[PDB]
Amino acid sequence: ALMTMVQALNRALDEEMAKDPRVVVLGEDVGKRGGVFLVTEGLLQKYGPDRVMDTPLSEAAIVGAALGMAAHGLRPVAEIQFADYIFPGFDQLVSQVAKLRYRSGGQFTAPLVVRMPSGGGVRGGHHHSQSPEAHFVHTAGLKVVAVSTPYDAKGLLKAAIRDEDPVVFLEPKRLYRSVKEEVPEEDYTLPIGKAALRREGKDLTLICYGTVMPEVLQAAAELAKAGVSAEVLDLRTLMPWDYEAVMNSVAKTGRVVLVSDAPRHASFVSEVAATIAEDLLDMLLAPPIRVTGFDTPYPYAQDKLYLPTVTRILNAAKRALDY
């Protein structure tokens, strides 16, 4: 049956919690309220306060406690109300969570998940729109996943919960209820570290993920009207990203445009772009072009313009095509 991303995420949580008593949920307003976006709705009622717990208003406490719980015996799925608010608990994330296995020679592990809504397209201003994935990708020891469809949301969240490595799970808030897709109720997982081919093409490769998918997909549609077949590749996992899928697509088309709503400088798409250039220069028929968020804090008034538009993506595609 069809369901939104919120429902798929809720289902994934419900399913894993029923399967493993060790799986617990913690964060601000996740219990009684069921989450500010209702992702954890009904879980407290079904599993109890010792499985779903509202925490004090401290991201350091949430992330850090989750790390301790994971190291001792639980499988915590912590929630940071908005990706923008991970910073108060940033040291816990980069100094404790990310480095635990490494610094302890593998003696201690962190089987935990930190999920958080992210991205703009919802007029969130400075702290209700950020996409901080670059900060996580840059930190060795953290797996990073950003979903864009209900089907992936359920499959990848279940995979993250089963994965023993710490996973930062980003959920583009604009996509929480933007569409109802078929999501099997049957138990299934999706592979972390693997991209998903949304549309096959041979004239242009469109590398993207999360928040910008709607515009990227419509841009490909517009291009199709002009006889241009764009291959759309949703990376899904940002760390470790699907090196092979990316290079295979770029080798085929010879031209690539990478899209994300995260700020340009030292962004994840910049990493992929630099890697394509370093490894596939000989296959490039045009320069790798990046369409990203601007290097400014996220603006409220110009929210509509900060987030890459179909036009902005198309202009970059034309540039790559006419090169």
Partner: protein, 362 residues
């Protein structure tokens, strides 16, 4: 005079019958007392106007402050607007109004028009004014606490005689930066007053699941500074206790932590739903504690209030609101280009390139 610290019972000055309970004489002239009342009505009416702005789609977000009027107006009058500094949070529009920030600017920010001196950079409920030293609201909870401490240290070092007041809710007291900032201010004996507008909830998380200390005032023990538990629905108790803390800071005796117990009558925000976690029984109990009718009785018992004046003040306030909204709206939308302004004093090469890129699309 010195109020008692860490009292088990919140400090009160207004009797339920309008009697004065102070262990010192009331020294506010009738004119000043009526102004406190006037500002609370204005704050309440602004909040009710906000509800309408949400309905009519004029603004996309509001944080109801109804129930916080005594606390917010008291704070605004306990300091010197334009001289002392204020580090507020999103629910302080009543304080902003009482402080003197033009409605045009407050509403301009709510509507993101050019009337907003903050240039529509953030979502609603993020006012800020250089003129009135109202440090622009930031979204991360308690992130403004360390800066408040820093501003106060600057005031001390530069011998300006200013004080910095910092307001926050009960949830904010759980953040590490809240603790870290106040600790530094205390160690430096900085002129900062930290004030909690405790409504017993952080969206849906109640006080009991927020912290284990019986009160927020008790936390002052962790800094070696005085802590006060006050009836935040009592405008006089709030005014005098905060004022005393301000004077203490001004004379170089260091910071204080003042807990003003209030109640959030409306939901957490327009994006929330109050009746989704609070017993209508608790809301009703606190509804009988509305700070406005309580102070009205106090003024009435002293020949400082009557129905005619009441209506006169309300009509003047609604006219100010209408005029304020009109000015804010006629200001016009903020230009798309402004998205690249103020990141730095001047736009670097990359921002100039990005601005040119956007223009291709406009």
């Amino acid at each position: 005079h010195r109020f008692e610290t860490f009292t088990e019972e919140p400090i009160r000055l207004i009797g339920e019958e309008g009697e004065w309970l102070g262990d010192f004489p009331l020294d506010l002239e009738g004119e000043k007392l009526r102004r406190l009342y006037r500002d609370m009505l204005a704050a309440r009416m602004l909040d009710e106007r906000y509800t309408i702005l949400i309905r009519t789609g004029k603004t996309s977000f509001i944080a109801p402050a109804a129930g916080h009027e005594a606390a917010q107006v008291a704070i605004a009058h306990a300091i010197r607007p334009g001289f002392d500094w204020v580090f507020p949070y999103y629910r302080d529009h009543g304080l902003a109004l009482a402080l003197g920030i033009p409605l045009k600017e407050l509403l301009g920010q709510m509507l993101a028009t050019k009337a907003d001196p903050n240039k529509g950079r953030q979502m609603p409920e993020h006012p800020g004014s250089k003129a009135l030293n109202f440090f622009t609201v930031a979204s991360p909870i308690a992130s403004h606490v360390p800066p408040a401490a820093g501003a106060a240290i600057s005031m001390k070092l530069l011998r300006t005689g200013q004080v910095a007041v910092c307001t926050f809710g009960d949830g904010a007291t759980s953040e590490g930066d809240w603790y870290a900032g106040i600790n530094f201010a205390a160690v430096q004996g900085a002129p900062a007053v930290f004030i909690a507008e405790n409504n017993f909830y952080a969206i849906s998380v109640d006080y009991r699941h927020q912290t284990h200390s019986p009160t927020i005032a008790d936390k002052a023990h962790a800094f070696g500074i005085p802590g006060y538990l006050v009836d935040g629905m009592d405008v006089l108790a709030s005014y005098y206790v905060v004022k005393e803390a301000v004077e203490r800071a001004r004379r170089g005796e260091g910071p204080s932590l003042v807990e003003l117990r209030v109640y959030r009558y409306g939901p957490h925000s327009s994006a929330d739903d109050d009746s989704r976690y609070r017993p209508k029984e608790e809301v009703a109990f606190w509804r009988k504690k509305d700070p406005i009718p309580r102070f009205r009785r106090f003024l009435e018992a002293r020949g400082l209030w009557n129905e005619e004046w009441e209506e006169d003040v309300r009509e003047e306030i609604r006219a100010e609101l209408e005029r304020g909204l009109k000015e804010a709206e006629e200001a016009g939308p903020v230009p798309p280009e402004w998205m690249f302004e103020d990141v730095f004093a001047e736009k670097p090469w990359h921002l100039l390139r990005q601005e040119a890129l956007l223009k291709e699309e406009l």
